[PDB]
Amino acid sequence: SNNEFHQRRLSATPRGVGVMCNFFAQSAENATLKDVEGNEYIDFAAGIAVLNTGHRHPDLVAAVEQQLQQFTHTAYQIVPYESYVTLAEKINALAPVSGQAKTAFFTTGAEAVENAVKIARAHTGRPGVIAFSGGFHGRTYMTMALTGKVAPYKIGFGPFPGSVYHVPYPSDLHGISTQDSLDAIERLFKSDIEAKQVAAIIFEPVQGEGGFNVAPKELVAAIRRLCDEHGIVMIADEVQSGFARTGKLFAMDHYADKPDLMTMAKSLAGGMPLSGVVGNANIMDAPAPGGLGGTYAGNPLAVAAAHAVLNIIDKESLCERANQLGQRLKNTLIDAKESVPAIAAVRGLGSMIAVEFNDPQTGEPSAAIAQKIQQRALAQGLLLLTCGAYGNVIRFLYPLTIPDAQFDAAMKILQDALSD
Amino acid sequence: SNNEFHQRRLSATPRGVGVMCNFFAQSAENATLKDVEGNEYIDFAAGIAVLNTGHRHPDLVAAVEQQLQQFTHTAYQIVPYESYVTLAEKINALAPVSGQAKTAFFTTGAEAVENAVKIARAHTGRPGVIAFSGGFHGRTYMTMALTGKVAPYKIGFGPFPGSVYHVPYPSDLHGISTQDSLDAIERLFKSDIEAKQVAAIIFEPVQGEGGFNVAPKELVAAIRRLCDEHGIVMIADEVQSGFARTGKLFAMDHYADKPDLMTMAKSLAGGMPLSGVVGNANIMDAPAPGGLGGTYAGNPLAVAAAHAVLNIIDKESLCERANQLGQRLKNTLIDAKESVPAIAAVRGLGSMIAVEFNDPQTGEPSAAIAQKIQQRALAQGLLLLTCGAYGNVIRFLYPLTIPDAQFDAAMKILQDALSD
Amino acid sequence: SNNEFHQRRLSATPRGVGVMCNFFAQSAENATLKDVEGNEYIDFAAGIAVLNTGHRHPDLVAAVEQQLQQFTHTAYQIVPYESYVTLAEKINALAPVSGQAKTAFFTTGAEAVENAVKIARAHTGRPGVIAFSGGFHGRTYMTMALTGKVAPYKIGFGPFPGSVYHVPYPSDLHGISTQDSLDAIERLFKSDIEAKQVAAIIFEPVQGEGGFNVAPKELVAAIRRLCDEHGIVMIADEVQSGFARTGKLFAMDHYADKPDLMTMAKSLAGGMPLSGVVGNANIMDAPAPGGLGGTYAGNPLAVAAAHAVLNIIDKESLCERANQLGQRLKNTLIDAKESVPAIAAVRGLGSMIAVEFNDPQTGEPSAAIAQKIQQRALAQGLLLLTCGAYGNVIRFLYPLTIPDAQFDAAMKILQDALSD
Amino acid sequence: SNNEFHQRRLSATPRGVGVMCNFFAQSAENATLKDVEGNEYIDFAAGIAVLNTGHRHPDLVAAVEQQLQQFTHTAYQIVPYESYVTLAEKINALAPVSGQAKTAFFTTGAEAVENAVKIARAHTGRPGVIAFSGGFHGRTYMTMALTGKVAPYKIGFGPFPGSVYHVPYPSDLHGISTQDSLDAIERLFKSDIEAKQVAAIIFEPVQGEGGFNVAPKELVAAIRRLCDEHGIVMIADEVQSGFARTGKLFAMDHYADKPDLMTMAKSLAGGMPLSGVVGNANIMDAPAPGGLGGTYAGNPLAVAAAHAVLNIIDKESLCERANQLGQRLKNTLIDAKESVPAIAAVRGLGSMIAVEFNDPQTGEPSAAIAQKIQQRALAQGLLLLTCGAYGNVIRFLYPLTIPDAQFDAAMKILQDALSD
């Protein structure tokens, strides 16, 4: 029963860990999710862009099973294992970072961001960090501070550390330009903190919870220029955009400038708990032995899954397929724009696409319309996710391995849900 | 080759992720670890107290495979699952908290400590946190601040947030008494922060990296009293001491006073990435919906493994067994105390036992002697771990499921390694 | 000799205490300063807007001597005196605060700002403070944090406290509007700190060292509105703009909205060390007995001088006079705007008037032209002061008591320095 | 009327500015204070150790009037003057700082400490500051954090900056030794902050508000040793102990080790608002020009007063007189220990002497007995001050210029007030 267990969950767990759906997952494969009462759903959430290679991809299951017949945990900081080194070598070969790449593995994306910040601070000896409004980087203390949304991520968890600031993110719909961001960064350097006291600038090439806003090329170039000038570490948070989501393996592959450090997680292990930081070896080697670590860091099962994820992305050509699916979804949303004026924007990159809804009679961002369209899709068996500053963005996070027929059915459902 | 991948590792990964052993893991079962060249080792590390049920316990592997046939990740905050709820119910039933309990799951122990601090700050509306010298609570920013050992955990990652203080932990060999701890707390209340601005007091009932120092009953009682008097949340970090290690399920079960919050990890899932926080349901309900979470939180495979772990500790009487094994180890160490004057102390609870070595001609802490015994034991096939402030303590973290014959062989090897 | 003592100065005092002039003061009266070698200077600095009533005003001197016959210091928090209370009563009656006013006295302007922040934190129980870029509020740690100009005030003195942020200040010449300020405040609320975690918003009605930028009426109204909505304390820093400088007694008297707190110093005692905070009695009474104080606070001689200063401002009609002299200066500057293309702006209120210079060919802010005009004037005997974000602003801080003929001589000198 | 003005004072000023006496000062000279109703009091407060040279010493009045006929304020950072340089040279010639000295002047002692910390931070590039429990250093934000007494100086003004810690001050009565302090410093280095991240260790040679505890020679030597070893700036806060109070010109003259920086105020100008920092020239020169300052800093009248105070201390042999008067008061207090069992301790240095009362029927610190003696002596026309962690200590801060007959009358009054 989904109601019995709804009450059991509300009684056993705190209200702080909120849950979107009131049905309980029973099984899942690729992009199909069945609950405990037999209802099937098309998963356009992918565990929040974690299942780019799909629920229980057979190669991932095979790799996890093979490793489960060897060992699940030795603590890498005690007894190492080759799979860690080989995955790090492959990431170094593929990651677009400055200089020669070195990679370390942790467990959660928040741990990856934390360690990127630790590496930057140890390299520069500086305290400051600049992030962007609307950015999301984790739910730990420091990663909350870096996160550019207060409600609900930061309510009641303050005070937050000093030397951490935010500048507005370029958004065409809201009149924020690249030059607005650069002016805010300059106002930081002239009012708040010395440029030679800022250790890192951290940014998402495509903001996840921010509404799938893409960083303009000028912005990435300017960030690279400022970091080169002032000795600041450039951090690209590719935790959500990484691994073929944006049409290339990493979102940063769409830009000429390379960041110094890059954080990875979610789809890195295709449904297993793994994260990592990859970047310039001169910067990564700043902490001494013992300065970085984590007990679950580089979990053998998750690392095997990540090897499988890389091979799947390659052999099934998930980058091109991400581009094709994103184009089809854009076509559907733009065609619907003619009949549903509430659609205010269609943005994104590759298969990282989102639609933002304004009230057609007011012009103000309306979360109500987004919620009701999300209700309609769900009742039709389509699981959609909400994001944005005002919670009026629907982001589409289908697995890149979703079959064509199921994707077309999902487009039909989305068309019927857009139009009342 | 155990030495070609050593160079590969040094070239691909950052220096900051330190590694103790020069060999690479190939397979592991219970307390037996086999490297890529075939060498066998008796694992007295258990992945740093993560494998209380031993490497790949058959029931844990069966549970993980069963779940692997259903789904590995749905993002719990999007789509929940019953295994999370039932595991929370079991932890609530077993946790040493006064009154109604509530449990939330995350992925890493540092994440659990972070959420305990978030819960305490949301409940009290205060900033301050008081921890203990020699304590270890994670490698994230806030958990580094709570950690009471600067070298090597905090070197280069400051500055650290305000309102976080440390008081000395009682140690009979170092002359620190419970009254010393309480006087330092009072000095904090009179010099650094008013008690009504302290949100939590976090402590390990048995210090992990601190040298297995056991908290006196008077200290736990004074902490409970100070917390009730000033409205401070009492946090017990049982990440390393939890799950049958100390002879009871949780170390706090050795004391009459119950904490408000308790953090769990490591052996909770017996080799899978899972952590948690259980406590006073009213305090746990302090953060509003949306304020707590984490993408991997309560990973389904790890949840299944944790169910298995609870059932294994029950059905195989691992508390009783930890008491027996700790007693055998203490007998071996005391029988050696007459031939080895370097044995300065033997401390701990249950099967969380450590031996501290001083120099037999100076009386000063001797880390070299401990490293030499460790060196000798590793050549005989026994993997031992060091800890303590001065690196002069050897901690015994054998899996609780180690067979009697292998344990007795390890005792013989240990007697030889102490022999000089 | 001015040289001998210049070298002795460099040898005995730190380089960090910067000194603008190469001559040493010997005598001073009203707006006339004589160096130790006999050279006379028309003082358009007034000790940085401290000598509004002019150097050694006879009434101030007579009051100071009369008190000197009584006592110079008793420590007010030990033994109080009636001059403190009567000055507090006069300030309470004259301050632009809604409802019952209370006034406390301290010694320096930074001390007044510090106590205003302390009062706001005690009244709200919140950590945060929001200030404006280009603002100056003192050289102590918290007041450096509030100051919105890094160079040179904050170089090497970090890190600075968390929960302290800055927003742009409206300027017609730099493209910053009131709505830009309000949007940045909203971005703070949405990205950095909860609105109901901000204790105060501190602002200058007329930015002193920032270039004499006048706060538009809409900005003050919006600040008042936000404070009423979020329960934030509205702090007006009138240390430099206060006491008849802007054509009315306080700059806030030009606006319909009233602040919760107002800080006073500089011309408060007309050349004696005294500061003060006046505001809402219910808010002022937030700190408990024993929370506010200062050994020198409300020094008797400075309090007598401040009594004299109020009586001088009233009897010699210094508000009206400030308006007249500001109009004469504006006539001179606007007249010169036809021959000097470098004159890009002439702004201010009353006798708080500044001219900003841009390059006549490029249009960029030209600090070199400003310096050039300052040296020309200095060579003719006119002591002028620089300010602005780029050091390209000349501020006119003559004593309001300056004789008309001396003012006209200074205007002629200024006209000569503006062209050739 | 003292009652009518008592009510007026409570009406016009905030409750936070606490006031000890309910009468209002009318006149004062040397050690005799007259209120508005004609009552005379022997001033054993000296405005909280500010009038070592006495109320309105004739030489100080003469210097102040001479300067008042010249100028009262020019803003030293705009136009300098001789008296600043000559006073700095005299301080450099007399101050016991390691190496050749430079001196800067400010206005309040809190500002002096603020600038000492600024100088240490600029010199070292480090954030950390270590202070002592029971120490008092100012009522500003940073000097609050440095202060080691929460009630009443810190209540409601948090949260406080990170990297600021406190260690116990050696006290014979409370069982705190030098080695306790050194162990707490080592615990800071091993649990809280790296030694190479601490910019300064600030301490009072004789704690003022803490109860006149004298720093033992071993403690000063250990602070000097640790500061030399780790690059930490050693700061002696002699705002209260300076200028012949302790029997030598500065308290540090009783010790063989020299601090790097020394802060001065209070008696520095003998009742006029002045403060200063004197220290090693190389360290003082750390902030770039424009980094240090203050509008009122180095007030000409106060600087003339400081010249006069130095001359008075020399010509009237105030150091020797401080020793003599301290010995006479100690004789009076020890002889009273026989009939007053409440006298638990009589401590101090020179004429910086305090008596600590415990309850003779339980052994508990008694602020009530101290206050009864205070009011008993006040009824007889003798004005005493309280202090201590528990408010149970009587301080004797008579002016050093007090005549012998008045001192003997005060001793008579003190003897009668000690007994019931």
Curated annotation (Swiss-Prot), chains A, B, C, D:
Keyword vocabulary terms for this entry: Aminotransferase, Pyridoxal phosphate, Transferase
Modified residues (N6-(pyridoxal phosphate)lysine): K266
PROSITE patterns in the record: AA_TRANSFER_CLASS_3
Any single Pfam family the record assigns to this protein: Aminotran_3
Induction notes from the record: By putrescine.
Originating gene: puuE
Catalytic activity: 4-aminobutanoate + 2-oxoglutarate = succinate semialdehyde + L-glutamate
The protein's name in its UniProt record: 4-aminobutyrate aminotransferase PuuE
Record carries keyword Cytoplasm: no
